[PDB]
């Protein structure tokens, strides 16, 4: 039960402001370098 | 305030390149240990339907690598979901569901799960859940049947467990 989240639970937190924070620039750099960075983000 | 995950998870991206070796095609992207940090990453990466052919996404915990050579996988095996008659978003949704099952720790034998891999190929796409012990039938079977539930797989979609190791 502890540290267990259902699909509904996890989805709810998707709209959390902390879930809205964009990746750091280093990570973003790595994502663009791999070309896996989502377009128009 | 962030909600902690049971495990640290690491995203890996494989880009198929004839020049480099199987292991060297794999690229470690980032690690996270909270629900919020997961969504941050997931919202800002291309879905599986949009990545190059021959490429993989993989998510693994305990700093385990998506490689045969890793000790955590050597005695392990995997449930393999071959996707036939699946849409691009069916793929994206099924992959996302697998991710949520893993980071959510939805399995009773969550200790046995090492990670999940999605392979993007033209002939056939595959999503696999890697297990730590191939000989632990009860753990595999529980993970298998719950996976079939959480993913709500159709009859056309096949689910088969297999050992990583090549053995007679």
From Swiss-Prot, chain B:
Keyword set, alphabetical order: Cytoplasm, Initiation factor, Nucleus, Phosphoprotein, Protein biosynthesis, RNA-binding, Translation regulation
Compartment list: Cytoplasm, Cytoplasmic ribonucleoprotein granule; Cytoplasm; Nucleus, Nuclear body
Superkingdom of the organism of origin: Eukaryota
Tissue specificity note: Expressed at the posterior end of developing oocytes (at protein level). Preferential expression in the pole cells, at different developmental stages.
Molecular function via GO: eukaryotic initiation factor 4G binding; RNA 7-methylguanosine cap binding; RNA cap binding; translation initiation factor activity
GO biological process, one term: regulation of translation
GO cellular component, one term: neuromuscular junction
Disulfide bonds: none
PTM notes: Phosphorylation increases the ability of the protein to bind to mRNA caps and to form the eIF4F complex.
Positions bound to mRNA: 22-23, 68-69, 121-126
Assembly behavior: eIF4F is a multi-subunit complex, the composition of which varies with external and internal environmental conditions. It is composed of at least eIF4A, eIF4E1 and eIF4G1. Recruited by cup in oocytes and in early embryos, preventing the interaction with eIF4G. The interaction with cup therefore prevents the translation of key transcripts such as oskar (osk) and nanos (nos) in some regions in the early embryo. Interacts with mxt. Interacts with 4E-T and Thor.
Family: Belongs to the eukaryotic initiation factor 4E family.
Function description: Recognizes and binds the 7-methylguanosine (m7G)-containing mRNA cap during an early step in the initiation of protein synthesis and facilitates ribosome binding by inducing the unwinding of the mRNAs secondary structures. In 0-1 hour embryos, forms a complex with me31B, cup, tral and pAbp which binds to various mRNAs including maternal mRNAs, and down-regulates their expression during the maternal-to-zygotic transition.
Protein name in UniProt: Eukaryotic translation initiation factor 4E1
Organism, scientific name: Drosophila melanogaster
Organism placement in taxonomy: Eukaryota, Metazoa, Ecdysozoa, Arthropoda, Hexapoda
Residues of the full protein shown: 80 to 246 of 259
